[PDB]
Design a protein around this nucleic acid. Structure first.
Lengths: 158, 56, 49, 99, 139, 114, 144
RNA sequence: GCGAAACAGUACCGUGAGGGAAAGGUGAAAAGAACCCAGAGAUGGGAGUGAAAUAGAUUCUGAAACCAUAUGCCUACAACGUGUCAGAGCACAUUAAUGUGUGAUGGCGUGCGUUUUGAAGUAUGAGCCGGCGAGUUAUGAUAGCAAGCGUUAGUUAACCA
RNA sequence: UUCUCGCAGUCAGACAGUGGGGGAUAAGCUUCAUUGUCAAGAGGGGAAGAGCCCAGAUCAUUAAAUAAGGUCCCCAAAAUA
RNA sequence: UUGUGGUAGACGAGCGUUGUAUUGGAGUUGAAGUCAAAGCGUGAGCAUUGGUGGAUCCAAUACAAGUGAGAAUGCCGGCA
């Protein structure tokens, strides 16, 4: 900022008898270097207040949008097990249903490590908690391994 | 004792065209294989008719 | 919508920025007076004045 | 011999087999028109216009005159706007003007 | 051909250099050397040696005729000037610029290489219009 | 944050400088003088587009009168005759070109006499 | 819009003409002389061409003026210095080089043109009738 | 961007508090110019290597202004903010366009930004080119606009995961 | 043209006609009143004529009709009595 | 039909670039910059071809700006 200049801002000029600008302050905002008034400030609030009811309305809207389209389909806990960390079996399952087209996210609430250890090298797919999803995430995923348990749980939870 | 503006390119070229210089004199040496200039010496020791100085 | 495209719903209304251009119309002043104390920067009627 | 044509309010005395330019009138390109707003065909003068005498006109192209750079700037007053007025034209010729 | 010989920034004023530089232009191979040997100027010996080197280069590397030669071109392009200062009375100092000139001399044998550059430029513009035309075709 | 836009400025100056050529000395080399010359030339073009039709009409007035004086008659009388009776559409410059058509303007001459 | 009214392609050529001023009045002869020199009556006369003709004035010593203006009017011309105003009346120029007046008065009515300089020269005034222009086959006329 | 990409708080200024500068980029790997012509030599020119000698240690690229050179245009009788609209003539064919390069001659034509009631002004400021360059935010109030919820209604801060 | 909301800017006015006050019925005067102009709007004319007159500029136009005003020429248009 | 004289002053509609988001893409069989051209644009702009240098950049939609240069007797640099 303009109060972070170095050295006394004395004039090397005279108050008169100069053919160019006086510029009592040396590091002016127009002078090269020094003298920031506005500039980039980390003081940014970064906050736009949002209301809970509108947020729930938006969540229900996006749920309705994806439920009507349902590019993805139901997946159960049984297939989440018996799998290794290997993306070999994961990618084989994806190409079995040609799932390499969608940048799928997997919603997790049971915390099964079998699928969890996977989906970490191929960055087209990844796993995140269902309660930690967002419309940004939802429309970007274009498909979600929707858990067997959550269906009625999500419907009741809205 | 001050001018008003800078000399324009065309005006500067015209004014420096006055510095055009003519050619020097010329004289083909007779007892010297070189080519001297008129009313001057040639570096073969002879001013003209006879040897007058050193070869340098 | 989709991740590749999005359109607003009459958001981002017209703004008013000063100090840039005179062909933009109503430029550096756009209502800043002429030769006045309030015509200066940070110069405006104090609520206690 | 020739033909006087009043395009809008502008006259043209154009002879046979001459391709010249008038103001654009949404004319069909490359087609034939019996133009009536005519006068002075060949030693032929009618009072308002040439009665029972019309010209047979074929068109060659439709274009626009080069961009007229209309600028409105007021000195020391800051009122400056810019626009380009490309006035269109029809380039056409007369072929077999009838009498 | 061109017989280009470059000097690259000796300390000589472009004004001072250009005078003799263009006064020695227009003559043949030797009627320039002989007259240059007779001029009492500082820019005589250096450019005479430069011209001798250029002639030797043309006669040795390219093996040209050496007789139909003429002074095709001499120019004094911008040589980078130096910046110093000189004192003036009442305790002052004024900036002084030391001159120079990127000197180069070119010699041609045939009365040509003027139209040849025009032919190269025309070939360039022809390739330009051809590249544009093949873009205009293939619809 | 610093935004990198140091090229569009030169693009703008070259765009404004491109129209400036054929000017005597240093009037198509600098940027601000180029702007001023463009403004002055634009004003000249505007005033031409304003008044050149008037100038051509006056030129035709003079030339048509001279033709009429070549025929031993005044411009005013001829214009009155043309306007008063047997009104036609023939134009001043087209009449001038009819004068360039030998004996064809004279056909009008004994036509207006009739 | 335009029909491109035609002009001559530098086809200008002038002709020699003869005139004598005995019962002629300065302005009355001057207007017609100017019209002849410009080619003003011509239909192809453009201000950048001036398709005029050569004019020869014979016996300029016989021109006549009306009224007392010979002894009343005066013509000024100031030289480069003070007192360089030669101010001559008509009666003075009657007994002096009135031909110079024939030149300058018509020149005063000339167009404000760089080449009016070049067409004021087309007038050749003579107080007599001896000139090689007679051998140039001139076309005589009256009230030129 | 720390002044500070380099050996910068260096150089440098002063006695001293104190200040206080400029400067980065070879190429893929020097693969760095072996030999030769001239000179005193640098160097240039050849050559030779590497795809690449705008690839020479001047070394990522290489603008504007400026400086010159000449192809085609014209100018040494001519009172002009030097341009414009017409246009001869000269030389051409393209980002085909009633073309472009130049413009005998004619007509018209007192710069800009500034505060000024008011300058084309002998008011004002400008050597030019190029780089940077001067209405932002945090919180709060109000008016409009858009949206949600909407009648015991809407809403959290502090915060905790 | 009345009202609400918000944002204004303007002050150092000038010119000419008409009423003037002061002067000296001096202003290129100062001050106010009305009208019109410029400021805040260019253009045709008068030799140019910031405010004089005519008249209110979308643009292109080698079209017509006019207003002020003009018609020997410069530079455009008439002579009849 | 009014329309368009219009500074100040009030108001509106669009353009360009940087980065994010994604959708696409070009690229040593040649990115971008630059210059040249006898383009398109309604002004913001979009090009295209060609040249040089050889590796990044263009386009569609929203967001955010140390976002938009002629003077500042502007600052720096080079050249007069």
């Amino acid at each position: 900022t303009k109060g972070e200049v170095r050295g006394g801002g004395k004039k090397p000029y005279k108050q008169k008898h100069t053919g160019k600008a006086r510029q009592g302050s040396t590091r002016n905002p127009h002078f090269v270097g020094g003298g920031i008034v506005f500039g980039p400030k980390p003081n940014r609030n970064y906050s736009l207040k949002l209301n809970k009811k509108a947020h729930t309305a938006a969540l229900h809207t996006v749920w309705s949008e994806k439920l009507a389209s349902d590019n993805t389909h139901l997946v159960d806990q049984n297939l989440f097990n018996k799998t290794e960390g290997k993306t070999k079996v994961m990618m084989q399952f994806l190409k079995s249903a040609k799932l390499l087209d969608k940048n799928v996210l997997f919603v997790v609430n049971t915390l099964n490590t079998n699928l969890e250890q996977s989906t970490s090298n191929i960055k087209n797919v990844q796993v995140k908690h269902l309660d930690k999803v967002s419309v940004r995430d939802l429309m970007l995923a274009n498909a979600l391994l929707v858990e067997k348990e959550v269906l009625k749980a999500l419907e009741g939870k809205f | 004792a001050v001018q008003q503006r800078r000399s324009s390119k065309h005006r500067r070229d015209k004014r420096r065209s006055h510095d055009a210089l003519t050619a020097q004199a010329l004289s083909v040496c007779q007892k010297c294989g070189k080519k001297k200039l008129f009313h001057r010496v040639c570096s073969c020791g002879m001013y003209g008719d006879l040897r007058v100085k050193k070869a340098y | 919508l989709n991740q590749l495209k999005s359109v607003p719903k009459a958001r981002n209304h017209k703004t008013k920025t000063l100090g840039r251009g005179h062909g933009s119309g109503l430029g550096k002043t756009s209502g800043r007076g002429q030769k006045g104390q309030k015509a200066r920067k940070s110069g405006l009627t104090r609520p206690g004045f | 011999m020739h033909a006087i044509v009043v395009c809008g309010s502008k006259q043209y005395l154009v002879h046979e087999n001459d391709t010249f330019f008038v103001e654009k009138l949404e004319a069909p390109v490359g087609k034939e028109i019996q133009l009536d707003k005519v006068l002075m065909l060949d030693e032929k003068i009618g009072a308002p216009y040439l009665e029972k005498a019309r010209v047979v006109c074929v068109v060659e192209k439709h274009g626009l005159q080069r961009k007229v750079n209309v600028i409105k700037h007021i000195s020391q007053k800051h009122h400056l706007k810019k626009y380009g007025h490309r006035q269109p034209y029809t380039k056409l010729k007369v072929v077999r003007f009838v009498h | 051909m061109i017989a280009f010989a470059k000097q690259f920034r000796v300390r000589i004023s472009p004004q001072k250099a250009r005078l003799v530089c263009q006064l020695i232009v227009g003559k043949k191979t030797a009627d320039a050397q002989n007259i240059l040997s007779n001029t009492p100027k500082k820019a005589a010996t250096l450019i005479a040696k430069l011209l001798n080197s250029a002639i030797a280069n043309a006669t040795n590397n390219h093996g040209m005729n050496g007789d139909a030669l003429y002074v095709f071109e001499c120019v004094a392009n911008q040589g980078p000037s130096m910046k110093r200062t000189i004192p003036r009375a009442k305790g002052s100092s004024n900036m002084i610029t030391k001159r120079s000139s990127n000197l180069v001399v070119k010699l041609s044998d045939n009365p040509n290489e003027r139209q040849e550059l025009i032919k190269q430029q025309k070939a360039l513009v022809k390739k330009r219009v051809e590249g544009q035309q093949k873009a205009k075709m293939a619809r | 944050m610093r935004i990198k836009g140091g090229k569009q400025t030169r693009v703008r100056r070259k765009k404004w400088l491109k129209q400036a050529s054929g000017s005597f000395g240093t009037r198509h080399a600098s940027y601000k003088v180029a702007k001023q010359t463009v403004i002055q030339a634009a004003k000249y073009a505007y005033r031409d587009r304003r008044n050149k039709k008037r100038d051509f009409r006056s030129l035709w007035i003079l030339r048509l009168n001279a033709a009429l004086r070549e025929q031993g008659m005044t411009y005013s009388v001829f214009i009155n005759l043309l306007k008063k009776h047997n009104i036609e559409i023939n134009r001043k410059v087209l009449s001038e070109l009819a004068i360039k058509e030998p004996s064809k303007f004279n056909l009008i001459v004994q036509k207006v006499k009739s | 819009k335009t029909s491109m009214l035609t002009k001559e392609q530098a086809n200008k050529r002038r002709q020699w003409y003869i005139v004598d001023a005995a019962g002629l009045v300065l302005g009355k002869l001057a207007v017609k002389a100017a019209d002849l020199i410009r080619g003003k009556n011509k239909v192809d006369f453009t201000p950048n061409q001036d398709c005029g003709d050569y004019l020869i004035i014979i016996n300029s010593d016989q021109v006549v003026l009306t009224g007392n203006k010979k002894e009343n009017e005066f013509w000024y011309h100031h030289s480069q210095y003070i007192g360089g105003i030669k101010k001559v009346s008509g009666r003075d120029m009657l007994k002096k080089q009135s031909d110079k007046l024939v030149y300058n008065a018509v020149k005063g009515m000339l167009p404000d043109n760089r080449l009016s300089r070049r067409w004021i020269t087309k007038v050749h005034v003579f107080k007599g009738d001896k000139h090689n222009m007679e051998a140039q086959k001139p076309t005589t006329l009256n009230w030129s």
